[PDB]
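Input for the complex:
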Amino acid sequence: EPMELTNDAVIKVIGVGGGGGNAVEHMVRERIEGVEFFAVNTDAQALRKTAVGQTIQIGSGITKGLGAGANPEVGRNAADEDREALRAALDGADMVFIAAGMGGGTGTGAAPVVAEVAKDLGILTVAVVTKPFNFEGKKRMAFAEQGITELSKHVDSLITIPNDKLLKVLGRGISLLDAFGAANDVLKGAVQGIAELITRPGLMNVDFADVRTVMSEMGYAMMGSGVASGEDRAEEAAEMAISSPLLEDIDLSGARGVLVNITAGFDLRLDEFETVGNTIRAFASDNATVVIGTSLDPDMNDELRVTVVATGIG
Amino acid sequence: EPMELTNDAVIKVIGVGGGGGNAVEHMVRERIEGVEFFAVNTDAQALRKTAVGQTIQIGSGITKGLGAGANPEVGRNAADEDREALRAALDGADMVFIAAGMGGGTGTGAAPVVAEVAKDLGILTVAVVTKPFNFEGKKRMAFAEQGITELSKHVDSLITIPNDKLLKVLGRGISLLDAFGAANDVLKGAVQGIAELITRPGLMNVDFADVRTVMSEMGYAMMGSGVASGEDRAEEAAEMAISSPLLEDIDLSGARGVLVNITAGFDLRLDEFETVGNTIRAFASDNATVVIGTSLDPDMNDELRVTVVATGIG
Amino acid sequence: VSSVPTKLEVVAATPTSLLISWDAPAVTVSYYRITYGETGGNSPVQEFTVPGSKSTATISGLSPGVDYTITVYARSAYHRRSPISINYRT
Amino acid sequence: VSSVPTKLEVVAATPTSLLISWDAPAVTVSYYRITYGETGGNSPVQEFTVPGSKSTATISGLSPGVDYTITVYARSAYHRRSPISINYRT
Amino acid sequence: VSSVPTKLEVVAATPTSLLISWDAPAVTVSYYRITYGETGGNSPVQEFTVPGSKSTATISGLSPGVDYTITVYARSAYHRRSPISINYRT
Amino acid sequence: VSSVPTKLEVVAATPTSLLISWDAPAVTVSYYRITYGETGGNSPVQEFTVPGSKSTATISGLSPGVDYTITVYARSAYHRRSPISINYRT
Amino acid sequence: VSSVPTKLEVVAATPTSLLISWDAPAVTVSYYRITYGETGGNSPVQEFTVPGSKSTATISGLSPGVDYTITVYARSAYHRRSPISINYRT
Ligand SMILES: Nc1nc2c(ncn2[C@@H]2O[C@H](COP(=O)(O)OP(=O)(O)O)[C@@H](O)[C@H]2O)c(=O)[nH]1
Ligand SMILES: Nc1nc2c(ncn2[C@@H]2O[C@H](COP(=O)(O)OP(=O)(O)O)[C@@H](O)[C@H]2O)c(=O)[nH]1
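Predicted:
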């Protein structure tokens, strides 16, 4: 107990379902720093193939290790019967990221249960879930909507990333493997943009309390990002982040809290910090809680990345 | 018992009779993945020649190892007296494929008994049986019809593949060895099309529960497949699968469940998945349970295979 | 012998099965109770019954290279004689 | 056995979890109380309850290479039978 | 043979082309997939399909004195048989 | 490959220049960051950016007979994938 | 235990400090009296009080490699229970 007050922030990322497990395996391969990774799945074979290091097989007495199918209720019952393993894995963390692909059985039904356990443990719970493409039918979309509505009741923030928004930036005649790799990259980008403010901060930094200020009991959230280089990198990156397709569904002036991550190298300037902050606060609302910090990437030169998370959209 | 919940799906294929044993030996040679193969025959010499790895000699006290002849009753009595060996071989499986050639003595009479044992063990039982050619006489056809009627009472799904439908695609002046090799290939194709959704799934996958949803307590089933390449591969393959000669005996709009397997390489696209699903759901009925998954063949490039199983025809 | 059946023969029908044969009884037997399992093994034996008109029984699912013990009980309404047991090493 | 449940099986579902299985009871059990912890360890054991209709329980957060002791209590309104305990070395 | 097609013949129609011939199939083939490239070469192979009613295929743009490997796939709705491969040195 | 871009080609357009080519990306790239310099040289590398709609880049002022290392970064708002590096000896 | 507090934990927050933790009391405590000093040392111990709503206390100015003894008194208007003492070697 005394050591829990004198340690670094513990951040856990749990992927629920096949899509969530694939996304978390991608995050493991791409080496997010200062984060522990878990995969939770009903299908034992898929779990045995996932290279995430620590795996939990839920619903072993309901699905026999053969998957929950396309039924969210079976996934919910599978997660309901193994709340002890979920509690044991989640315990000891300050922030938890729940990555899942809404629409299936395991992820859609089991993400709310993991979220409920994490919140009842007093953990800052951020759900980073996607919606299926329109190419996947209407049943998957209805399941995803129901699962998102259920999940919003047990999370602090819920970042929704519609896959249909990714179609605008995907190459023509692209295989679904590459499209879902892009979706994995977007989920990893959201997790990294929120977590690297804590794990690898810059000189102008924010602490876990600042993050919890805008990520706690907020509800629905959206995420957008932008990059730029040259002399006008700050303004271009900020405007590109505000005008992200993953943010166009909402109005930034209605959000109850904005979290901004500026990733750069050793050449960020004070006026660039000021202009990014001014752009965000100009396109936000007057009474919104705005938290702006910087992260450090040693391999960025003359370039600047800006990530914006808008919370409390409702 | 605890390990039975944390293991891969166990799929067993049992060939009953001489034709079934030949088909299962063909499947062994062609290397279906993640499947265990058995041959059950009254003739001990034929069993000694079958290279399937695990063999069971039924009726050793009624036929003395000399075969049951062309009498289905003798085959039924031969299988009835060795229900313990059948139970011991079948036990421990999630799905069982019973491959046989209807018309003879051993297969026609013994496939229903193996099916009854498998169902009483609580196993998903799929019977993939053929009917004899019209070149084989009327007695074989009557025996086959009686055996199929008897077998339909103890199976979850019964896929009937009439050999007369194969005559439309067989070369002119073809020896019966090549015709029955084609029949073996068709039986292996049915087994592989149902089992590779589980054994080697794609990125858009279905689990054993999804398969059991459309393959359980359904009754009669039919199977059709198609291939295509180029830009229009998905629509062409789907339309060719719907218009298969092995499916023309029924109407796809009367089936109570449709199982679709899309086999492709690493270049399947989302719109292709959507258009195959849309074609199948357009030519099916509104309230039919449609399950669509993908399988992976690394050696397929720019080409696409679609397998359709229609269940609950009645 | 004092045990019914008096004779017991086991033959490997297939590399993973066994054929079991016993002599005909002098008194009608209603059914035969066969209990097979690994010799000196902690796992419970497997049991099944064949009708008394039969004289052979086939057991499957046998792991090669493992000793097996087979016992046959002859259950009749007219006696309570002892069973006969045999050992077979696959 | 005199203890309910009479049989207890443990299987490592994942390299950091355990699956626990017990036999069905002859008398209805309202819930099962499972207490797991390091064998001969000073730290207090972890405890949780599953409903009595269940037959399996999964425990997570287990350090590999460390011995564990698992005890299952069958709590019914119709008996007060002893628990059953097992030792598993991860 | 176990591979469809079973026979494969290659003839140099012109000093910079090859004519490829295979036997007729016992079962209807929808199309043939031919993949040709330098034998043991890092460059990706070239691929094209001919309809299944055909029995010959001509490939052009071949550098003389360079080994080539040709593989033919017979794609039918009724089997998934292996392809057949041949080596030709121009 | 895990690095965007996945393919990188370099051609000497003139005896004192190099043409650099990479494959099209699956996800929109805003700009490409190219860093070229002498391989294993103490001098700082030269850097420039081309827009993401481009697929080629020309670098000049290259001394013949000197090794060069070229690295391309694909900067997109939707990923942070690794760069790809190539070595060319003029 | 008979002493309030019943549990006492010490952790080295920094190489020259210690973090002290005790369990919550069953009865309201007005303040805690902590007395720390070198174990078996002639020098007088250092003393300070924290309010009873707290559960942790940090002590600084600690020489590494020197044993320390820490005693916590729970002063309440409703009991006069004994203190608890711990030994920590820096
Ligand atoms: N990011 C990502 N999303 C996926 C992947 N596979 C599937 N999805 C999405 O996740 C949703 C749920 O599918 P899936 O997770 O496989 O089903 P489940 O395992 O039963 O929960 C689908 O609608 C897909 O849109 C993947 O590999 N990566
Ligand atoms: N697929 C396939 N079917 C066969 C083969 N041989 C026979 N059949 C068919 O199976 C039916 C039953 O014959 P068979 O299995 O040999 O008789 P049984 O062994 O006494 O059951 C016949 O009507 C044939 O049409 C074979 O090698 N392969």
